Amino acid sequence: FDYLHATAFQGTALARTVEGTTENIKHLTRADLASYIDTHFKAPRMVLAAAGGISHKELVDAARQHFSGVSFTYKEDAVPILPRCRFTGSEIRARDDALPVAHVALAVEGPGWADPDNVVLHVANAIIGRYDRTFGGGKHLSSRLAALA
Amino acid sequence: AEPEHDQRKRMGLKMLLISALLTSLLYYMKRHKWSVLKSRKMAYRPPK
Numbered sequence: 001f002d003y004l005h006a007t008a009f010q011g012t013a014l015a016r017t018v019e020g021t022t023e024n025i026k027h028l029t030r031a032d033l034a035s036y037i038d039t040h041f042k043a044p045r046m047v048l049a050a051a052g053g054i055s056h057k058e059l060v061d062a063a064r065q066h067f068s069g070v071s072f073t074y075k076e077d078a079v080p081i082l083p084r085c086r087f088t089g090s091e092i093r094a095r096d097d098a099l100p101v102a103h104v105a106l107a108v109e110g111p112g113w114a115d116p117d118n119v120v121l122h123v124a125n126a127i128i129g130r131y132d133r134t135f136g137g138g139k140h141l142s143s144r145l146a147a148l149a
Numbered sequence: 150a151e152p153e154h155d156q157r158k159r160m161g162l163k164m165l166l167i168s169a170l171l172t173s174l175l176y177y178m179k180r181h182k183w184s185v186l187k188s189r190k191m192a193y194r195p196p197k
């Protein structure tokens with residue numbers, strides 16, 4: 001799945017591993033860590049969510065008290081919009097006939113959170129569903145591919 | 150000696166024209182498909 005990202009969005013930022021590079025994790029500095037927190041962990045981009053036996057007011061009240069940091073310039077109320085990530089039809093094959101099984105992953109460019117189409121898509125993905133050795137379903141499963149599989 | 154003579158050269162022309170066009174049009178479709186292998190890049194990444 002990382003490799004899938006690494007070449008599907010290749011060249012862009014999306015195409016990076018979350019855990020980051022080996023060199024980076026070897027050199028990051030108190031400094032660099034700081035900035036990340038400072039530059040990114042900002043209230044207009046954070047969300048306090050909770051569920052349970054809590055009163056809405058009670059909750060917010062606490063927020064008002066610790067999530068202080070009130071801003072001056074308009075900059076701080078602005079959500080930096082991100083550079084587009086270019087999809088690119090392609091493949092990356094990592095071979096090692098020494099492994100027991102092989103994993104393959106195919107994909108097309110998705111629509112993006114907002115789109116009302118994601119619904120249809122998920123309806124589809126359900127039709128094919130998923131399967132796995134232990135599934136008691138067996139040859140009677142409804143997913144054509146599961147059945148053939 | 151060769152009554153066809155005329156119709157023979159007329160076709161010749163026609164042949165040269167299709168043949169020019171068709172050969173080129175295919176030089177594309179041969180490359181197009183092959184591109185994948187020509188652009189391809191590989192690397193040897195042994196383990197640690």
Ligand SMILES: CCCCCCCCO[C@@H]1O[C@H](CO)[C@@H](O)[C@H](O)[C@H]1O
Nearest residue numbers: 151152153154155156157158159160
């Ligand atoms: C040199 C003697 C030429 C005699 C033929 C005169 C007509 C040439 O013309 C050709 O004749 C063919 C007939 O088989 C047709 O099928 C072609 O469409 C026509 O262009």
